Design a protein around this ligand. Structure first.
Ligand SMILES: N[C@@H](Cc1cc(Cl)c([N+](=O)[O-])cc1CCC(=O)O)C(=O)O
Ligand SMILES: N[C@@H](Cc1cc(Cl)c([N+](=O)[O-])cc1CCC(=O)O)C(=O)O
Lengths: 258, 261
């Protein structure tokens, strides 16, 4: 019985191959999660089909309707058997689905265009000449909305009140905005993506400062899933054998363009 | 029928330490540290009463190959002697096979400790020379990491360490640190990054953590398989992290109390 894998088009985790049109099935896709899915299925002994999440979302529960969207939605409503993607392990998600132990550790970080005289969160919060912001929705924004730490609360108030808006619709828009803003915009995003973009042409961005927090991506399965236990052991084994580090290197650095 | 939760832990600075005045104290209050504070939080969120007990054999948890017996805190859980372990206990495959772990409350990796001034910047640097000796604890997970590693650099280091004379291994973490401090830049110590960072903030302020971490892993709260507490404990850990409490706790024990500026 073929396992339905839900995932999301997010570089360099899952991308359509340049020559995808001459390809079929799983082979249409490449990336860190594509490689990880193969390793997991190999170790747990299952065949699987990669499917792209229908609504292009990760997974948030609507406050009013209480409906779950994205890949979490596909798990809880029975459309997919497992999610393999840069999906953060969080309390609200863990209440309705299971996560493996983390396959990648990350935190919120700062992206600047090279030349921008900013070196940390503190620096940013102490000035306004260089605008800075986050995705207009989701986890990073929420970190600042809910934060009780002085400097981060400060940054948050600055962001809500800054004009024009410092928020962006998509991660790509955030990156593009840093790139086209001639050193006058800084983007706060997950460190994994920051580190990746830093190795891509035109090589005009960099990561500065330490991560503002600490979290991890996990493989997700429905509660009670007969795959959950084996998938978790697979992630730990892959980590312990150095495979996860090797996959990170392959996709961030070896295939790097800088 | 409800019973007090038996917590197994271990004396390891700054996770769990006996208070200077422990003699005039009783029970849990004899102890202080990061893991003491964390246990308080977990129990508070999960709503259980608990008793801190120190692991009888002073070990974290490994299965003897010959006897097949699990020692340490893992063993306590596996053999039914404790309800939960709260300590710098790494989540690993062989342990997950026999107990449950929460998601990590702390992230870490194997790292290099040097005496300040030592001309070494990475594992790669160490492996390519022998003038500056380097080693690990004479047992446990860091040594086992190098023994099992099929990564070229780490295997080469293992081969060097196993054959180096005099012995580059040490009996305790304290010994390794002391050896770094006394060896005039001629000994480098491989240990978990958490402890490395801690020691870096302690007088005489003569050590330094250098290079990237050699691996990536996490410490987790452990319960016996099928335990009733496992689920609630896991959600508690996630909440504490998201609420910023785990970072604040690490700051308290590592940096606020820091002795090196
Ligand atoms: N891990 C997030 C999804 C996500 C993934 C990536 Cl890889 C990036 N990113 O490219 O910086 C962002 C996000 C959303 C937060 C953000 O704005 O960083 C989740 O589980 O909700
Ligand atoms: N997390 C390890 C135990 C441990 C804890 C600490 Cl706090 C340090 N350390 O202070 O460097 C080391 C170890 C492992 C021995 C060693 O590497 O010396 C486990 O679960 O086996």
């Amino acid at each position: 019985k073929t396992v339905v894998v839900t995932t999301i088009l997010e570089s360099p985790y899952v991308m359509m191959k340049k020559n995808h049109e001459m390809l079929e099935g799983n082979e249409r896709y490449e990336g860190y999660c594509v490689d990880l899915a193969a390793e997991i299925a190999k170790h747990c002994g299952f065949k699987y089909k990669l499917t792209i999440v229908g609504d292009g979302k990760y997974g948030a529960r609507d406050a009013d309707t209480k409906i779950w969207n994205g890949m979490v939605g596909e798990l809880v409503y029975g459309k997919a058997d497992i999610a393999i993607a840069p999906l953060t392990i969080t309390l609200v998600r863990e209440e309705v689905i299971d996560f493996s132990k983390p396959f990648m550790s990350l935190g919120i970080s700062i992206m600047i265009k090279k030349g921008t005289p900013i070196e940390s969160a503190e620096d940013l919060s102490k000035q306004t000449e260089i605008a800075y912001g986050t995705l207009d929705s989701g986890s990073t924004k929420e970190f600042f909305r809910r934060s009780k730490i002085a400097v981060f609360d400060k940054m948050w108030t600055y962001m809500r009140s800054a004009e024009p808006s410092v928020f962006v619709r998509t991660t790509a828009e955030g990156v593009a905005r840093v790139r086209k803003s001639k050193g006058k915009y800084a983007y706060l995003l997950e460190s994994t993506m920051n580190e990746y973009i830093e190795q891509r042409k035109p090589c005009d961005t960099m990561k500065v400062g330490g991560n503002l927090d600490s979290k991890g991506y996990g493989i997700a399965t429905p509660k009670g899933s007969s795959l959950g236990n084996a998938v978790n052991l697979a992630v730990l084994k892959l980590n312990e054998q150095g495979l996860l580090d090797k996959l990170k290197n392959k996709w961030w650095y070896d295939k790097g363009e800088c």
